[PDB]
Structure 1
């Protein structure tokens, strides 16, 4: 290309960090790159196949602005947000559910579980503010799943159910970040 350089030259996207038969997730961070580093903003690319589900997870600290570049997206965003419900129950929790058409935006704030299904082949642009040291914690599947990391007698008290039972149920998910959709 341009046999002249050094500056903020363009950048695009190299090895996906999650990928399989249902989707890929590309991600560049303030860490791994020069121009974002100052912005402290990160970016990502979502590429999933119709009927595929990106299991629930959350990002420790970055707030992710998600632009639907193409296809249809079903979205499940939960959270409590307002402690202005200062006495426990008051700020009961929410399920913000919506399908995003091409053009739409949805914001994902740091600690909220989120999951999305591609109701049709999907390409999403994601811009995450406060991106330094952000870790994604998965709540289902076989990889990066945080639950599964809970000690047998821990689960025992955390859940209705038993330790044997909880390892059980969690080992029942073979895939990892993206996953076949189908209901009932």
Structure 2
């Protein structure tokens, strides 16, 4: 422990990037921390109420490693992922179905869409790879919504429903990132 504060000391989690009554997520970037830049590693921790859900999402450049430290977590994950194929028809959109535990590791690739629901006041550890200025783009919810950022006029064109349908549903879920597992 000691006292001589100086020679490459330490780093801990001050604040969530995201805090909702549903959960929290602390996150150190090599942009914030002085040690890290040098590894190209993102630190992250989270706190998920015995009920939350991480809203459908992807990291633009980060392949996240996630060990479940406390609890049991259901992992949902999508991806199209292997072009060493001579066309598209070939490769497919498979769904990654999996729930973890107290020793489980899960790697989340750079642009893959996933969510985790809570099946315990579950604590998650995740180390961020290739992570020099990575965006946590969100496909659902209120915040961090990209969709919502697609204009009325592209929307129609972009999914049967138009300004109406499209515009409105995104607007239903007045929550954020972490959300009601409210299973049905």
Do the two structures share a fold, i.e. TM-score over 0.5? yes
Larger deviation, residues 59-68 vs 5-14: 5-14
Query: Would you say 1:94 and 2:99 are equivalent positions?
Result: no
> SS of the counterpart of 2:137?
strand
Contact 1:50/1:121 (8 A) holds in 2: yes
Within 2, Cα distance between the matches of 1:68 and 1:161? 39
Within 2, Cα distance between the matches of 1:84 and 1:91? 9
Within 2, Cα distance between the matches of 1:117 and 1:123? 12
> SS of the counterpart of 1:53?
coil
Contact 1:55/1:178 (8 A) holds in 2: yes
**1:15-42 residue CA offsets vs partner (Å, 9 max, x unmatched):** 2110011100100001001111100101
Name the counterpart of 1:167: 167
| CA RMSD between the two structures | 1.1
Name the counterpart of 2:31: 31
> Per the alignment, do residues 136 and 86 of structure 1 end up closer, same or farther by CA in structure 2, a change over 3 Å counting?
farther
| Deviation >6 Å, runs of 4+ | none
**1:89-133 residue CA offsets vs partner (Å, 9 max, x unmatched):** 211111011000111001001100010101111100110110101
1:16-95 equivalent positions in 2, closer than 5 A:
16-95=16-95
Please report how far the alpha carbon of residue 52 of structure 1 lies from its aligned counterpart in structure 2 after TM superposition: 1.1
Please report how far the alpha carbon of residue 2 of structure 1 lies from its aligned counterpart in structure 2 after TM superposition: 4.1
Name the counterpart of 2:149: 149
Count of residue pairs brought into register by the alignment: 184
TM-score by length of 2: 0.96
> SS of the counterpart of 1:12?
coil
Please report how far the alpha carbon of residue 68 of structure 1 lies from its aligned counterpart in structure 2 after TM superposition: 0.3
Within 2, Cα distance between the matches of 1:182 and 1:41? 34
1:123-138 equivalent positions in 2, closer than 5 A:
123-138=123-138
Larger deviation, residues 140-149 vs 7-16: 7-16
